[PDB]
């Protein structure tokens, strides 16, 4: 695989925005995620869209595209990214600059809706992006849990490659919905004991590869839409959607056999599922799906919306154990 | 392809659910539909799973396969049609006994959701299916739009298979959200003139393929997403979307190299579009993401979640001519 250089404390990362223009309705958030990653020690360079909106995007599909190009050229950038999803990622993918990811590898960072660029680039070049904070949503966050994934971030990026990395598991999240860009807080969130459970017996150790599985649906079938293959470890998560676009989403993947390839699968923590008044959660809707498929499931990893983020490498083998309740990166994923 | 034998007076349509539970949770409007066409002579199958619900869904995935399968066993019956679309059709698509409908041809009709089955079943069995009218939401309304929606319905199933098939095109047209599921209306719909629009020139033919465009999302990549090829008409309609999701979807059709193989595009109106305060249309994002591509498209054709809905059968070649602003039928579609 194509690896970036770790990143390091001082370094400069780029921001974009590919999708929803947050850098302006949600202003005083994506102040506080510049203000946090500055008082870290970091330098930031913002992309040419901040500050700009196209009512429901930050600009056209090749401005958008420019503004992530642009990033890519600069030679002082280490980190790229995003600031916020939104829906329209995937767009930019036959205009990104794949000859210059490949001629100068960079971290790539972000979730949600930028999975499509996430997927799309590693399609295109073999490179080892991240599944993990973005800007505004994860580090615009107010303390304690800001702290838990910065503390996974820096850890994920900034560590020494040698030897398997086993994720240390948040002993508390949240999912509530207050918060968000208010300047002063009326009451921390209520936080949740971490109810992630591991479904199956013995070791699973492959290729993870995924993302948000509604974005997903905007590549697939696609150049850009990586092939998952015999052995793949199925990372997936989703956000607010209910209990039927859910049904519909599993039900996808199996269509498109791809519960006869993997062997597991990460569901991330559903932020406010709607379970329509049936009290059912994901994992009882795969399963159904699943129809009598004896695949190993990790229920509730903590890198999806909810709160703390995890920072998880795409591209790269993991191994869950099942019997021990961890999750481990076993392979290179920086140079 | 395989073709059903045509609908005439006094035949038997079956009714089936195969997502949503609108014959319990719209059952005023689904009383209304089902002596709308008792009263026009035609005699109703009740499928299994009628009056039932399973909060979200009418049933279990088999016991959706099963309601549907069991009125294709059923030889009285001379049409199937969907109750009411919703989000979760495409989970039956292992389960349907797609022998027996080789073996017992139907008419099988529909929409919105439904497209799952009626992509799917084309993509099995090379059955030629129809995109129009559901029981509850196309039967189930208010005059005076449910008998232009008729017309369309008999004149379409049951006239002699000889020559081209000229659509009518409706005088006024409705997207709104009122008149549901109540003895009375509120007050009357606003009716919109018809504001369809050829854009391009001559005449384009081809075999016509799609239905609606998020539900397709759900059977993509799959054996059971009809092959699209060079020379296809491409129909497409979605409802009540954001101008964000159209853009992702449109994109996705981009990227999966559509836009290289149909001669022309027919979208249907779009229902209740919210375009975000942007004041833009449908067509405007398709012609961004096209970026240059040349492609014909008849935007706002009746074949949608608006009232009146025309039937379209899919599989079968269309005519448009852009220069005389009309759309035909030029292959035979039933026996």
């Not at 002063?184 to 013995?202: D, H, V, W």
Request: net charge neutral; charged share 20%.
């Amino acid at each position: 695989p194509l690896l970036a250089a770790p990143l390091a404390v001082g370094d400069t990362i780029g921001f974009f925005s590919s999708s929803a223009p947050a850098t302006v309705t949600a202003k005083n958030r994506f102040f506080r995620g510049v203000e946090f990653l500055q008082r870290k020690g970091f330098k930031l360079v913002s992309g040419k869209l901040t500050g700009k909106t196209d009512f429901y995007r930050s600009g056209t599909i090749k401005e958008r595209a420019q503004e992530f190009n642009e990033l890519v050229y600069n030679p002082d950038i280490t980190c790229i990214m995003s600031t916020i999803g939104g829906d329209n990622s995937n767009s930019l993918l036959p205009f990104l600059d794949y000859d210059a990811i490949i001629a100068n590898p960079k971290i790539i960072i972000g979730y949600s809706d930028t999975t499509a660029l996430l997927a799309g680039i590693y399609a295109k070049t073999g490179l080892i992006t991240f599944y993990g904070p973005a800007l505004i949503p994860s580090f615009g966050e107010h303390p304690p849990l800001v702290d838990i994934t910065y503390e996974s971030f820096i850890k994920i990026l900034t560590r020494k490659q040698s030897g398997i990395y086993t994720y240390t598991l948040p002993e508390k999240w949240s999912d509530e919905s207050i918060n968000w860009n208010e300047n002063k807080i009326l009451r921390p969130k209520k936080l949740y004991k971490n109810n992630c459970a591991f479904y199956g017996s013995g070791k699973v150790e492959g290729r993870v590869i995924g993302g948000n599985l509604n974005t997903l649906t905007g590549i697939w079938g696609s150049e850009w839409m990586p092939e998952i293959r015999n052995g793949d470890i199925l990372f997936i998560e989703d956000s607010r959607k209910s209990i039927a676009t859910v049904e519909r989403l599993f039900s996808m993947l199996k269509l498109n056999r791809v519960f006869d390839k993997v062997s597991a699968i990460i569901l991330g923590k559903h932020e406010l599922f709607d379970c329509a008044g049936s009290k059912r959660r994901p994992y009882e809707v795969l399963t159904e799906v699943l129809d009598g498929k004896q695949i190993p499931v990790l229920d509730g990893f903590d890198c999806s919306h909810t709160h703390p983020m995890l920072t998880l490498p795409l591209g790269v083998k993991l191994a869950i154990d099942f019997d021990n309740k961890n999750i481990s990166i076993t392979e290179q994923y920086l140079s």
